[PDB]
Write an enzyme that holds these catalytic residues in place. Structure first.
Site, PDB file in Angstrom:
ATOM      1  CD  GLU A  11      -3.131  -0.987   0.347  1.00  0.00           C
ATOM      2  OE1 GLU A  11      -2.971   0.625  -0.418  1.00  0.00           O
ATOM      3  OE2 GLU A  11      -3.341  -1.962  -0.551  1.00  0.00           O
ATOM      4  CG  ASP A  20      -8.030   3.311  -4.186  1.00  0.00           C
ATOM      5  OD1 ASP A  20      -9.113   3.978  -5.207  1.00  0.00           O
ATOM      6  OD2 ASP A  20      -9.217   3.115  -3.794  1.00  0.00           O
ATOM      7  CB  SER A 117     -10.087 -18.495  -4.969  1.00  0.00           C
ATOM      8  OG  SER A 117     -10.716 -18.287  -6.394  1.00  0.00           O
TER       9      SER A 117
END
Length: 164
Positions: A11, A20, A117
């Protein structure tokens, strides 16, 4: 290496309001402020987060305070979620870190795709899980950031973060 150092790598750290990867106003170590296009709305969220009238600028200590809160919130979110908790419980501490990252300020679409997943993770079918993860929206947006996290799920090592 640990979840804090890991997310710090992924980040970065910026002490002034920035946008972002999705174009949303953010501060510190990936602290999302708002999805609103209004910088004023972002500043309002920032002041409320910090507890003072800022100038769109915070200190490193303040950035780290938010970061710790956000890491906490991610773990909290996992433990309160019926789909995420059993998978998280089933994982070793290194792979748990990968989950925290996937859950860390992640979009609803990112979470949706990650959920698909989960079955592979819980079965410990690491290569299969990794392949399935690459199909996720997170991967499409940030192939590099996704690759590191997927390598962490695949191997249960910090190898993807050791050069960093």
């Amino acid at each position: 290496m640990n979840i804090f150092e890991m997310l710090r790598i992924d980040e970065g750290l910026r002490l002034k309001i920035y946008k972002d990867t999705e174009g949303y106003y953010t501060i510190g170590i990936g602290h999302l402020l708002t999805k609103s296009p209004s910088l004023n709305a972002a500043k309002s969220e920032l002041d409320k987060a910090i507890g003072r009238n800022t100038n769109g600028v915070i200190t490193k200590d303040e950035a780290e305070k938010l970061f710790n809160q956000d890491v906490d919130a991610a773990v909290r979110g996992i433990l309160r979620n019926a789909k995420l908790k059993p998978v998280y419980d089933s994982l070793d501490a290194v792979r748990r870190a990968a989950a925290i990252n996937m859950v860390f300020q992640m979009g609803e679409t990112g979470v949706a795709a990650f959920t698909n997943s989960l079955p592979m993770l819980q079965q410990k079918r690491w290569d299969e899980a990794a392949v399935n993860l690459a199909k996720s929206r997170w991967y499409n947006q940030t192939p590099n950031r996704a690759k590191r996290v997927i390598t962490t799920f695949r191997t249960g090592t910090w190898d993807a973060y050791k050069n960093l």
